[PDB]
Swiss-Prot record, chain A:
SUPFAM superfamilies: FucI/AraA C-terminal domain-like, FucI/AraA N-terminal and middle domains. InterPro entries: Ara_Isoase_C, AraA_central, AraA_N, AraA_N_sf, Fuc/Ara_isomerase_C, Fucose_isomerase_N/cen_sf, Lara_isomerase. Belongs to the arabinose isomerase family. It holds the Pfam family AraA_N. This is L-arabinose isomerase. Mn(2+) binds at residue 444. NCBIfam families: PRK02929.1. Catalyzes the conversion of L-arabinose to L-ribulose.
From Swiss-Prot, chain C:
Catalyzes the conversion of L-arabinose to L-ribulose. The gene is araA. This is L-arabinose isomerase. It comes from Geobacillus kaustophilus (strain HTA426). Belongs to the arabinose isomerase family. It comes from the Bacteria. The lineage of its organism: Bacteria, Bacillati, Bacillota, Bacilli, Bacillales.
């Protein structure tokens, strides 16, 4: 779906107390690091000034704050960089911060190491004084410690940069709701205002007839063109091929796909929701059309679930677009020793989780009482994964993350007419769900194979919301205590 | 004339067996005398027995909780009524509690008063001990002190009785939203879930296609017969070749709205002008008429004001109460006043003029020239109430205003309008209103008092701020700071 | 002279939407430009920025406000309805003092004219309210001024607030130089410099008095002569203190300190400094006339290492346009029934901008510092309304305390009092203010101003996010105690 050319500003801190020539060794050391990271992290590191004064620090932050291509700031105290200088800038920095607690040389030059070296590569105490200052200001930030060349440091920096880029998409992110929330449903509700203060989301509701007229203007020739792209991608079920009568169903989806994309592109929407209780002017419920916009980059939520729509977009950004989709727990496999969750949804499951080459099928749909819709049908993949809900507790949001394991279906489901994925939640179906329910997790989630818990925890930190994680170490007792103690901490905020 | 259930108020009298069973006979006799006399002229009072045991106390409360006719409980400690007895019942009670701290005789019978009297007529301390237990439980309740025949006691119960009835309406209240919120608008947004938990409001959004289908149905028309039975018309009248399908389209909108609202049980609704697919006209004259039946309305998807209007119309007994919006100011020194209106939907029950039907263009929403009631609003003391979501909790903001007759007419203004002089001044009240965060949409009423709205906040468990003749802006900011610290969490 | 001020400007931003055409934007734009131009005829220039209509326009002007070191405050006005969720991103970014001007181009309703087009364009009655909601919902502090934009009171209030916001923009830059540490064992002059740099923006750092001693040794004796010619330009000399007199030595020393002090503080960019009599190595006198001179030029100062008051004196002087503001200390009480007064001085350092007598250079012994007889300006303070302000550290947060007072002309001369002085009558009473002051924890060091109001100090405290308590004619000690209690619960979190 294409991102801004986001970049990370690498701001090195120092002080005049060793001279202007030591300020040159620092500028050199910093440029060598930035340039050597950029030999590759699909976002360039931009080396900015060595900063030595309150004013230089304050302005790199002011500038960071304002450049929309800056998606995070990485700050490293090369020398001692007295941290009160950093206050004024740190107060203004509202882009994500990473404190790279590193060091140019990797190993203590025994036989060399004198005071001249001790005056230059003193990161070991410089970063701690800067660390104090960021803590003393209550500022959320990521802290990674190691040599700037170590392979794990880059892993952590790479993971964090993906998160910071999501954070930047989040700032802009405009969501288009096509109809209200499903009536009397609770979890898909919330304060769009608060989500806009907290996450930057503009969560935009347009009457479904705005969408209905967009899909009528769509030429039959544009439909013909997309259909050849389906042929290029997705095997068709019987009767869906251009001859069979199911094609007016497949072509309508493709028509909806074109009315939608036209609309979402005209407004700069990167996420959107539909509602089956409001489909006036529509022939079908958006299904394969929704499935495809997801795979391209859009976030979706069913039944007006703007929260998960935004969440889906955001987790697509973190995953580099891969292995991520809106999700809904639909039934359980409770077979002792083999207990599984079956995740699916009405129509809308993104093909980027597919281990089967997706296949356009067409089936009836009781819900909404509109045309028998077309939709991609496939089995979700296998491997470690995460399932994420963002909910509104009223006074604040909570992000719930279940580390799960998706499994290859042992048997077929030929009568199941929508996309399907199986997964065994950690630490068990029993405790994951109890924990999930105590946490209040929604039924809508964003399932992903590529977003790691650490990234979502890092996103929550950046946004300043609670993130609770259900994984293999989760005990329900202590998890109850986490929810009690986190609640104490997050009031006000 | 939107009807309420026959709401009743359960008088409960508390006592104990320390004085005997003929003392109880007198406690029951006094209470029936009181309830009976109050019932010779709002809503009936029902004497509900003298309760004397935890279990009798718990019973009547459970009974109150489940009686959807019970809009409030009125409790009175005729004697000492040991208050722990009351815990398990007060814990259950979820209906408005009025603690009527009263006494049967008015005077101390000096010549006669003996220990058998002070055993029996000891509300003086029994009510204080009940006082402690309700306070000790944190419970919201009204307290009214005075003789049960005292005229002022009556005015205050009648007032509280109106708030309690509105509170019961609140617990039923179902709101239909035709379209979402107007776009990028902040104050009309909020948390429908929380508002359901705090006020009992069921706020549910129907796509306007649903309301568009129900007005593709008829009764031709009978409606227009009574339009002329009520309202002046303008050129655009009946023949009115130009503009009559304007009025026949609002009349159409009115009957499909009413059919949708009466079908689903909605006493409040909202329209948004940004979703009008299938509507030839943004609703206007239709909405003003539904409001005058008692419906709550909020423009641009404003459910909180929609609900608020409903409850204030119920508090007001249908009178002088309308969706409102500060539209423009008149800063003329010494004569500063606000022009409240809305793009169409002002309820005629605030009119001091005969309502006139006009049909004028309306750019907004890009639909046909809507028909609407145009009229000048009345004068006299009033309140202007906004209810906002601060994110963690709701805030009811109430401004006492003085509505004024307009000295100059506004002959090319196509909407109904009212002028008021807000207390204590345009400059300070607006400042307070803005510090408090009050919406542009409000409920104006001539017949809801501030005390009522405050009492509703108590029932509801929310902050109520009031801007009136005694408001300083600087102390008002303190009140906001101090309230916010009390109300967060709660 | 007077300490220099960056050219500060206030940005006038006006909000509206696209639901009305391109043409209405044109009229809103002209309306604001008219209002701004008529305003510049206010203390500092107003700059009409833009009509903002989108999220990204609101955010950019806000980013530009934070960045613009010339911008002292943003003045927002919602001409029409400006859906406030648009303003979230901008308001969350804005860190400049915000005034919300709730106003209206036209003063009166055109009764014969008014129609939907007018109701669609002059919508502030609600557009500002929708904006008031969003600002309140983010918990941001702002000023809110309501009136027609030509209103005289609207101007008086905007001038007060602008003076404040320029004091705030100085506070962010503000650099304080402590020559010496706190007077040993003193509590109220202590505090958290880190917290104060985070809250108010003040950079507060210690130099050894050695750094200043050596800077005064490098003063020419030719510039010292140039300065005495300026003392003759300005100040009456007590017997034995002009050129040739026995105690004119002492004035020269205070000339030398002044010129060294000024060179240290001009070199570093410091607008406020502190000295301590317990640390005077390398100086022949505790600085005094020098300080008095420097405060007169607009420097903040606090005795005994008191950076908090030093910063406060500089800020209030900015608020007061340099006029009638001075460091102050309650020295002694006149308790006479019906004439209760406080004599307020310091041991040397009272700024002459509060003088009612023409200041007189004098030289007297001073036990305190252990150094030579210090020269100093001596005068009787003027009379009238004034505020006495103190900023203290409660440990977890700052508290601004402001007493309204009425300065009085001395009825009886004080011939054997070697220091400048002022006499004031604290509202509502001496016994009640001192009680409320002591309960508030007021320092003995104050900043005293004839030209700073309480509403300005409150506005300053609102901008910084700190508690301000005012002691004046309406203050009763029982309700004051409750204010302190209830304020504490509010200010604990934040
Ligand atoms: O500028 C800092 C300095 O060089 C050393 O960090 C200190 O002396 C010891 O921390
Ligand atoms: O005569 C009843 C009487 O009310 C009680 O026994 C006590 O005074 C309450 O302490
Ligand atoms: O909410 C303000 C008012 O109701 C309307 O939004 C304006 O007239 C048109 O935006
Ligand atoms: Mn669903
Ligand atoms: Mn409106
Ligand atoms: Mn909320
Ligand atoms: Mn002192």
């Amino acid at each position: 779906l294409s991102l801004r050319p986001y970049e990370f500003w690498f701001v090195t801190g120092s002080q005049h107390l060793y001279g202007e020539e030591a300020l040159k060794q620092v500028e050199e050391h910093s440029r060598i690091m930035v340039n050597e990271w950029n030999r590759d992290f699909p976002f360039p590191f931009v080396f900015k000034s060595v900063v030595t004064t309150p004013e230089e620090i304050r302005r790199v932050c002011l500038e960071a704050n304002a450049s929309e291509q800056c998606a995070g700031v990485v700050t490293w105290m090369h020398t001692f960089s007295p941290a009160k200088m950093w206050i004024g800038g740190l107060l203004e920095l509202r882009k994500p911060l990473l404190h790279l607690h590193t060091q140019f040389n990797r190993d203590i030059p025994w036989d060399s190491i004198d005071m001249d070296f001790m005056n230059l590569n003193q990161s070991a105490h410089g970063d701690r004084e800067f660390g104090f200052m960021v803590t003393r200001l209550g500022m959320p930030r990521k802290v990674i410690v190691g040599h700037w060349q170590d392979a794990e440091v880059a892993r952590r920096v790479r993971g964090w940069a993906m998160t910071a880029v999501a954070a930047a998409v989040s700032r802009g992110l405009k969501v288009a709701r096509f109809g209200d929330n499903m009536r009397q449903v609770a979890v898909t509700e919330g304060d769009k205002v608060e989500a806009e203060a907290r996450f930057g989301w503009s969560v935009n509701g347009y009457g479904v007839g705005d969408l209905a007229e967009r899909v009528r203007a769509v030429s039959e020739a544009e439909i013909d063109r997309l259909i050849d792209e389906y042929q290029s991608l997705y095997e068709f079920a019987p009767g869906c091929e251009k001859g069979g009568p199911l094609h007016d169903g497949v072509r309508e989806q493709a028509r909806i796909e074109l009315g939608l994309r036209s609309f979402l592109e005209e407004g700069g929407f990167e996420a959107f929701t539909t509602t089956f209780e409001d489909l006036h002017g529509m022939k079908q419920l958006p299904g394969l059309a929704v499935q495809r916009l997801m795979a391209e980059g859009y976030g979706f939520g069913g039944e007006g679930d703007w929260k998960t729509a935004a969440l889906v977009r955001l987790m697509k950004v973190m995953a580099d677009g891969k292995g991520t989709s809106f999700m809904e727990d639909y039934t359980y496999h409770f077979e002792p020793g083999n207990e599984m969750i079956l995740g699916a949804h009405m129509l809308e499951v993104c093909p980027t989780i597919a281990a089967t080459r997706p296949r356009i099928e067409v089936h009836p749909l009781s819900i909404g009482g509109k045309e028998d819709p077309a939709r991609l049908v496939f089995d979700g993949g296998e491997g470690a994964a995460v399932n994420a809900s963002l909910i509104d507790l009223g006074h604040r949001f909570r992000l719930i993350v279940n580390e799960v394991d998706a499994v290859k279906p042992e048997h077929d489901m030929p009568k199941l007419p929508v996309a399907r994925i199986l997964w065994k939640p950690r630490p068990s179906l029993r405790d994951s769900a109890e924990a999930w329910i105590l946490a209040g997790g929604a039924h809508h989630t964003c399932f992903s194979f590529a977003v790691t818990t650490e990234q979502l925890q890092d996103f929550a930190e950046m946004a300043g919301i609670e993130c609770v994680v259900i994984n293999e170490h989760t005990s329900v007792s202590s998890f109850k205590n986490e929810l009690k103690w986190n609640e104490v901490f997050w009031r006000g905020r």
